[PDB]
C-alpha cells in the first residue's frame, strides 16, 4: 500500500522530508514513516549558468562641399532639437575626412 511520490516527500502523507543526517533513516514529522538514506543516491540536481553560448554609410548623402577637405558630398542626419515653436537641425558628416558641422533649420 505504498505510493509513488517524489523522493523528497513522504509517500504516506505528502509532507516534505528533511535532509539526511546523523542516522540511516530519514523520518517524517507528522506520520513517522521513515525512508532509508540509501534511497537518496539518485538525487542528482543539475544547474547550468551560461555566459557566451553563441560565440549606414552614416546616412544618406547630399551634395554639400566639406569645410576641410572640400569633398562634394556629405552625409546628413536630421533631428529636432529646439522646441516645437521653431526649426529642425541638420547634422552633416563627410565621407572622406569625417567632419561634422550642424545647421539650425
Amino acid at each position: 500500500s505504498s505510493f509513488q511520490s517524489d523522493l523528497d516527500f513522504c509517500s504516506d502523507c505528502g509532507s516534505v522530508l528533511p535532509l539526511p543526517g546523523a542516522q540511516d533513516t530519514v523520518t517524517c514529522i507528522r506520520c513517522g514513516f521513515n525512508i532509508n538514506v540509501r534511497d537518496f543516491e539518485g538525487k542528482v540536481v543539475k544547474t547550468s549558468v551560461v555566459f557566451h553560448q553563441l560565440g549606414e554609410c552614416q546616412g544618406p548623402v547630399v551634395d554639400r562641399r566639406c569645410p576641410r577637405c572640400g569633398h562634394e558630398g556629405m552625409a546628413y542626419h536630421t533631428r529636432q532639437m529646439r522646441s516645437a515653436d521653431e526649426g529642425q537641425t541638420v547634422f552633416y558628416t563627410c565621407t572622406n575626412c569625417k567632419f561634422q558641422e550642424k545647421e539650425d533649420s
Binding site: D6, D8, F9, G14, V16, P18, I29, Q80, S83, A84
Partner: protein, 694 residues
C-alpha cells in the same frame, strides 16, 4: 460600416448649411450624442461609484469590534446613500433643489449629503440602528445625483446652463475641477519586471520579480511583489501602512490552502517537470515552513499571526489565526474571494517568475500601454470614501477612549448617542482632495503618487475644455526624472493615445490625450457563466488532468482567476469562438472582453497563455472584424497580435483580420481639427494643439 457603430453619423464632408437656417436658435429637445461620449468615462464611473460600488464598499468594511470595560461594542455600516443636493432644512424656499449655476455664481460647493445606517451592538446582540449624518460629498454634474440629470436642452437653458452641457466636473468652491485619468498598472495581472533596484532590498535578492496591481470591486487597491532569489527561493513583499513585509512563498501557500506539500510541489512544477534546479528550490521553500514545527494550515496561521500582529494593528483580543487571515484579506490578492484561487494565482505569478529567471520569457514592458490601464474618477472617489468611512469608525473609537478618561456618568448606551455628535465629520477632509489635489491617506490607495489628482477645468475656449476630459496623465512624479523611456511614443499606442496631442515642454510625453475612437470601459458586469462556458469548450480545469501533457497547455486567466489548462491544438480555436461571441453578443460574453492568446513559439517571447480580461477601467477602441462584418472593441493587448488594416486596398486574404473604421482614427479630437495634418510637420501639429488651447 455597421449600424450602431457611433461613427455611422460621421459626415462625408463639411456642410456649412447649419448656420443659415430657421432651426438655428431653436433649442432641440435632445442633446447631441457625440459631445456626450467625451465625459462618459467620467460620469458612468461616478454612477457606479455612488450607487452600486458604495453598497459593495460598505460590505468590505469589516465589523468594528472594540473593548469597553469588559463588554464588546460592535459597529457596522449596513447601507450608505448620497442624497442629491438640496437646500439645508429650515430654509424658507420654493424650489428646494440646488442647481450648479447657483454654486458657480455664489462660489460654493455642489455637494450632497452622505448618511449611513450604523448598527451598534454590545456583547454580540444587535441592540440598535442609528442613521448618522457623516458629511457632504461633492456631486458630479450630469451624473445620476446631479439635479440636471436627463433634462432636455430647453429645460437646461432655463436653469442657466448651456445646451450640450456634458458633465464630468465637480464645482468645488465655485471652481470647476475635473479628476483626470491617471495611468495605473494593469489590474489583476502578472507583470514580469527586471529592476536592479530590487537587489538591495534583502539579503540575497535578484533583479527578477513579478508584480500585480490587485483591485477589489473598484474600491480597494493593493500592489504585491514576488522576487526571485539566487537560491531559486521566491519571496513575497507587500506594504501595509508604510511597513514593508517580507514573507516566503511556502508561508503564503501553506497559509492559504489545506493541501499537502506534494500538491503544492506539483502546482509549481507544472510546465517544467524535467528540470532539476526548480524541483530542488520548490522543495526548499516548503521545507522552510516545515522548520518551525508548522506542519498544518492552522499552525502556519498561528505563526504568521504572531509574527505579523504588532504592525497589522489588530485588536488585543483576536486569536492569531484570525489576525493572520486579516493580512491575506487585505494584502495578498484582494481581488479573489476564495483562498484557493489566491493559491492558484500565486502559483502562476511564481511560474512566470521561474520562466523569467531562466530566461524563457521576456520582461513585460511596464511603460507600454499593453500593460497599462486608466484610473477613472469613480475609482478615486470610491476608494477615498471607503477609507474615510473607516476613519470615521476609528474616530468613534478615539471618542470612546477619550470619554473613558475624565469619566462621565458613562452608563450603558441604550441609544444615548451624543458620541456620534462628537464623531469626525468628513465635510472638510473630503473637500481637501478636490480643492487642492493633495491626496491624504494612511494607505496610499494603491496609487503611486500623492498630488496632481484634481485639475481646474479652465474654460478659456471649448477646445481646452474638452481636453480635460480626454487627458491620460502618466504620472505627477515622472516630471522630475531625467528619463526619456517613460515619455517616449511607442507603437502600442496606435489607436489609444494620440501621437501629436501632447505638450512640448516639461509635461511632454506625460500628458497624453486619447484618440477619438478610443473609450474607457466603465460598465461593470458579472463573470458567472464564463468559466462554465470555457470548460464547455476545451478548457480542462485545474484539478483534472489535460489529455496532453503540460508545457503543451496554455494557462487561462479570466480577470485574475486561474481557470484551467487549454490544449495547444485547441487554443487558437477557442480564441476565435470567443471573438465570434463578443462581436455578436452571445452567451454573456461582454462586448469589451480582451481575448489575448499569447502563442507558444519556443523562443523568449512573452509568457504564453490565454488571458481574458473583463474588468473595467481599461482602454478599448472599435474596429471592423472582417470575417463577420461587425464592430469589435479591440483592447490594449489584443492589437499587438492582430493585423489591422487602414485602407480597404491594404486588406489582403488570410493575412488581414480587421480594419479601422475611418483611417484618421489614430488622432485625438483636437488634432483632427487641424486642417491638412498630413502635409505639415509633426512638431507643427504638436504646437498647434497647444495654440488652439490658448
Amino acid at each position: 460600416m455597421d449600424p450602431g457603430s457611433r461613427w455611422r453619423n460621421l459626415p462625408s464632408g463639411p456642410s456649412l448649411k447649419h448656420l443659415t437656417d430657421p432651426s438655428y436658435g431653436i433649442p432641440r429637445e435632445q442633446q447631441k450624442a457625440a459631445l456626450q461620449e467625451l465625459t462618459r468615462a467620467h460620469v458612468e464611473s461616478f454612477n457606479y461609484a455612488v450607487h452600486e460600488g458604495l453598497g459593495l464598499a460598505v460590505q468590505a468594511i469589516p465589523p468594528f469590534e472594540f473593548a469597553f470595560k469588559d463588554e464588546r461594542i460592535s459597529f457596522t455600516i449596513l447601507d450608505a446613500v448620497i442624497s442629491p443636493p438640496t437646500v439645508p432644512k429650515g430654509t424658507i424656499c420654493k424650489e428646494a433643489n440646488v442647481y450648479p449655476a447657483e454654486c458657480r455664481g455664489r462660489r460654493s460647493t455642489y455637494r450632497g449629503k452622505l448618511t449611513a445606517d450604523i448598527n451598534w451592538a454590545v456583547n454580540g446582540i444587535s441592540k440598535g440602528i442609528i442613521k448618522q449624518f457623516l458629511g457632504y460629498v461633492p456631486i458630479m454634474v450630469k451624473s445620476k445625483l446631479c439635479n440636471l440629470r436627463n433634462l432636455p436642452p430647453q429645460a437646461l437653458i432655463e436653469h442657466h446652463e448651456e445646451a450640450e452641457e456634458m458633465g464630468g466636473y465637480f464645482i468645488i468652491n465655485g471652481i470647476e475641477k475635473v479628476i483626470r485619468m491617471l495611468i495605473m498598472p494593469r489590474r489583476n495581472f502578472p507583470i514580469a519586471m527586471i529592476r536592479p533596484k530590487w537587489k538591495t532590498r534583502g539579503p540575497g535578492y535578484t533583479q527578477y520579480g513579478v508584480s500585480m496591481h490587485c483591485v477589489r470591486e473598484e474600491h480597494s487597491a493593493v500592489n504585491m511583489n514576488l522576487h526571485y532569489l539566487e537560491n531559486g527561493t521566491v519571496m513575497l513583499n507587500f506594504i501595509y501602512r508604510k511597513e514593508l513585509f517580507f514573507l516566503p512563498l511556502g508561508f503564503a501557500l501553506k497559509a492559504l490552502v489545506s493541501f499537502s506539500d506534494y500538491q503544492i510541489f506539483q502546482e509549481l512544477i507544472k510546465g517544467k517537470e524535467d528540470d532539476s534546479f526548480l524541483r530542488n528550490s520548490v522543495s526548499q521553500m516548503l521545507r522552510i515552513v516545515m522548520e518551525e514545527g508548522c506542519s498544518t494550515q492552522k499552525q502556519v496561521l498561528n505563526y504568521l499571526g504572531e509574527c505579523f500582529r504588532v504592525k497589522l494593528n489588530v485588536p488585543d483580543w483576536y486569536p492569531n489565526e484570525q489576525a493572520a487571515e486579516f493580512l491575506f484579506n487585505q494584502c495578498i490578492c484582494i481581488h479573489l474571494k476564495s483562498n484557493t484561487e489566491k493559491f492558484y494565482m500565486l502559483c502562476l505569478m511564481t511560474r512566470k517568475l521561474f520562466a523569467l529567471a531562466k530566461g524563457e520569457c521576456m520582461e513585460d514592458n511596464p511603460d507600454s500601454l499593453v500593460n497599462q490601464e486608466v484610473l477613472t474618477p469613480g475609482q478615486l472617489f470610491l476608494m477615498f470614501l471607503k477609507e474615510k468611512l473607516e476613519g470615521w469608525l476609528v474616530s468613534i473609537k478615539i471618542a470612546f477612549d477619550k470619554k473613558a478618561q475624565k469619566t462621565s456618568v458613562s452608563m450603558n448606551t441604550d441609544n444615548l448617542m451624543r458620541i456620534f455628535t462628537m464623531g469626525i465629520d468628513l465635510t472638510k477632509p473630503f473637500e481637501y482632495l478636490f480643492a487642492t489635489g493633495n491626496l491624504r491617506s494612511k494607505t496610499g490607495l494603491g496609487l503611486l503618487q500623492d498630488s496632481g489628482l484634481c485639475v481646474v477645468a479652465d474654460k478659456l475656449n471649448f477646445i481646452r475644455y474638452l481636453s480635460h476630459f480626454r487627458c491620460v496623465h502618466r504620472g505627477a512624479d515622472f516630471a522630475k526624472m531625467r528619463t526619456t523611456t517613460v515619455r517616449r511614443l511607442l507603437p502600442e499606442s496606435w489607436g489609444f493615445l494620440c501621437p501629436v496631442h501632447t505638450p512640448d515642454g516639461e509635461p511632454c510625453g506625460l500628458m497624453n490625450h486619447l484618440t477619438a475612437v478610443c473609450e474607457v470601459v466603465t460598465q461593470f458586469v458579472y463573470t458567472a457563466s464564463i468559466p462554465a462556458l470555457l470548460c464547455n469548450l476545451g478548457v480542462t480545469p485545474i484539478d483534472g488532468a489535460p489529455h496532453r501533457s503540460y508545457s503543451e497547455c496554455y494557462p487561462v486567466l479570466l480577470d485574475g482567476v486561474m481557470v484551467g489548462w487549454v490544449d495547444k491544438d485547441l487554443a487558437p480555436g477557442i480564441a476565435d469562438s470567443l471573438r465570434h461571441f463578443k462581436v455578436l453578443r452571445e452567451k454573456r460574453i461582454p462586448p469589451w472582453m480582451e481575448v489575448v492568446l499569447i502563442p507558444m513559439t519556443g523562443k523568449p517571447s512573452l509568457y504564453p497563455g490565454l488571458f481574458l480580461f473583463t474588468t473595467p477601467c481599461r482602454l478599448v477602441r472599435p474596429v471592423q472584424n472582417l470575417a463577420l462584418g461587425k464592430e469589435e472593441l479591440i483592447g490594449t493587448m489584443e492589437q499587438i497580435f492582430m493585423n489591422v488594416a487602414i485602407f480597404e486596398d491594404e486588406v489582403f486574404a488570410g493575412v488581414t483580420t480587421h480594419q479601422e473604421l475611418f483611417p484618421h482614427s489614430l488622432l485625438s479630437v483636437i488634432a483632427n481639427f487641424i486642417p491638412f495634418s498630413d502635409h505639415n510637420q509633426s512638431p507643427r501639429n504638436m504646437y498647434q494643439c497647444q495654440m488652439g488651447k490658448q
